Amino acid sequence: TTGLVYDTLMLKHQCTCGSSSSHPEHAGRIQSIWSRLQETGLRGKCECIRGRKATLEELQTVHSEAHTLLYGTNPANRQKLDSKKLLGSLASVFVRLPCGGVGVDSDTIWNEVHSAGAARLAVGCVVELVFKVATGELKNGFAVVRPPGHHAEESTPMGFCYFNSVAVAAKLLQQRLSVSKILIVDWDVHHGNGTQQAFYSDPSVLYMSLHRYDDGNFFPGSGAPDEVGTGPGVGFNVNMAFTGGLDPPMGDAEYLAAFRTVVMPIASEFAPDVVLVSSGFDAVEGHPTPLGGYNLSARCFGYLTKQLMGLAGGRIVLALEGGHDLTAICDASEACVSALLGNELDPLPEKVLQQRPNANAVRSMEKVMEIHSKYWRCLQ
Ligand SMILES: O=C(NO)[C@]1(F)[C@H](c2ccccc2)[C@H]1c1ccc(-c2ncc(F)cn2)cc1
Ligand code: NA
Ligand SMILES: [Zn+2]
Ligand SMILES: [Zn+2]
Numbered sequence: 097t098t099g100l101v102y103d104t105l106m107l108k109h110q111c112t113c114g115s116s117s118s119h120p121e122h123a124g125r126i127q128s129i130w131s132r133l134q135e136t137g138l139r140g141k142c143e144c145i146r147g148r149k150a151t152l153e154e155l156q157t158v159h160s161e162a163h164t165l166l167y168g169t170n171p172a173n174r175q176k177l178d179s180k181k182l183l184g185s186l187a188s189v190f191v192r193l194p195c196g197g198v199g200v201d202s203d204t205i206w207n208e209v210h211s212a213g214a215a216r217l218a219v220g221c222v223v224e225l226v227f228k229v230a231t232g233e234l235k236n237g238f239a240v241v242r243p244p245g246h247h248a249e250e251s252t253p254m255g256f257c258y259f260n261s262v263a264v265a266a267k268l269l270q271q272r273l274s275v276s277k278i279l280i281v282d283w284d285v286h287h288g289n290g291t292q293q294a295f296y297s298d299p300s301v302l303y304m305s306l307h308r309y310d311d312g313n314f315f316p317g318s319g320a321p322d323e324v325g326t327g328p329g330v331g332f333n334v335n336m337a338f339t340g341g342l343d344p345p346m347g348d349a350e351y352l353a354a355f356r357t358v359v360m361p362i363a364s365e366f367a368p369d370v371v372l373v374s375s376g377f378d379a380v381e382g383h384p385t386p387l388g389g390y391n392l393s394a395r396c397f398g399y400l401t402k403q404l405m406g407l408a409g410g411r412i413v414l415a416l417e418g419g420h421d422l423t424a425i426c427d428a429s430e431a432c433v434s435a436l437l438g439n440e441l442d443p444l445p446e447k448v449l450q451q452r453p454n455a456n457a458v459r460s461m462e463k464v465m466e467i468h469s470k471y472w473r474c475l476q
Contacts (some may be wrong), residue, residue: 331471378388
C-alpha cells in the first residue's frame with residue numbers, strides 16, 4: 097500500500113508583509129496539490145500518515161548546531177537552549193525585504209512565529225514516511241511538503257530552503273537502520289547543492305541530479321558534470337548537467353534519453369536498498385526563466401517514477417521540492433501518485449516517443465558518460 101503525508105501547519109510559513117503574492121514558494125502550492133489528489137480519488141486510495149516535527153538532534157545529522165538553533169526554535173527557546181553560546185547577534189542576520197517583510201537574505205523569508213515549526217514539520221513528515229517504507233510498513237510514498245530543502249547547506253539557508261529534509265531522511269536511515277546503500281535522485285530543475293555537499297565523501301549514498309546547468313549561469317550555479325565526489329565517494333556523485341540554454345529548450349525526449357543511457361544503468365549497477373527522490377516539478381512547461389525554461393510534460397514524471405520503482409524492491413519515496421505553476425505541479429503530482437499505486441499511466445505523444453534528443457542534450461549526455469566511464473562498469 098502507498099503512503100501520503102501532508103499537514104496544514106506547513107501552510108503558516110508566510111511572509112510578515114502579509115501578501116503571498118510577492119513570493120513564489122507559497123502556501124497555495126501544497127494546498128492545491130492536496131485537493132487535486134483528493135478530488136481525483138487518489139488520496140482515498142493511500143495511507144495518510146500523521147507527521148511530526150523533527151528533533152534538533154535529527155536536524156544536526158546534516159546541519160550545524162548553530163543553524164538548527166537559529167532556524168528551528170522560537171525566540172524564547174532559541175536563547176534558553178543555546179547554553180554553548182554558539183550564536184552571535186540576531187541583528188547580524190535579519191534584513192528587511194522590498195515587500196516590507198523580514199528576510200534572511202535578499203529573498204528568503206522568515207516568520208519568527210511560524211517558520212521554525214513549519215520547517216521542522218517538513219523534515220519530520222518526510223522522515224516518518226521514509227522510515228515506514230524502509231521497515232516494510234509501506235511499499236512506497238509521496239511527501240507533499242513545504243518549505244523545500246535541497247538547497248539548504250550545512251549552516252547556510254538559500255533558495256527558500258532551511259533544512260534539507262531528504263538528506264536528513266537519508267542520514268537517519270544509515271544511523272538508525274544501517275541501510276547500506278541509498279540512492280538519491282533529484283529531478284528538480286535546479287541543482288540540489290545541499291544534498292551534494294551532505295554526501296560528497298560518502299559512497300553508501302549515490303546522489304544523481306538532473307538539472308539545468310548552462311556553464312553555471314543558472315541558479316544555484318552548482319552541479320557541474322566533473323564534480324564526481326571526493327575520497328571514497330569518488331564516482332558516487334553524478335551530475336546530469338544540461339547545457340547550451342534554450343536552443344531548443346529541453347523536453348520529454350531529452351530526459352527519457354538521459355534516464356535510459358545515464359541514470360538507470362548507474363542506478364542498476366549501484367543497486368540500492370532504498371530510493372529517495374527530491375521531487376521538484378519546475379522542469380515542466382509553464383516555468384519561465386529563472387524558475388525553469390524547460391518544456392517537459394507532467395505526464396513524463398509518471399514514467400520516470402515507474403522506472404525508479406523497478407529499483408530497490410520498489411522501496412521508493414518522493415518528496416516535493418520546487419514547482420510553481422499550479423496546473424503543472426498538480427498534473428505531475430497526480431501522475432506520480434498514480435504510478436506509485438500501480439495504475440496504468442496516461443500515454444505520451446507518439447511524436448515524443450519517436451523524437452531523437454536535441455544536439456545540446458546529446459552533447460551534455462556525452463560529457464557525463466566520458467567523465468563517469470572511469471567509475472562504472474556499465475559505461476565502458
Ligand atoms: O525551484 C527552486 N528550487 O529547487 C527554487 F529555489 C525556488 C522555488 C521553490 C519552490 C517554488 C517556487 C520557487 C526557485 C528559485 C530559483 C532561482 C532563484 C534565484 N535566486 C537568486 C538569483 F540570483 C537567481 N535566481 C531563487 C529561487
Ligand atoms: Na536536480
Ligand atoms: Zn513579503
Ligand atoms: Zn527548483
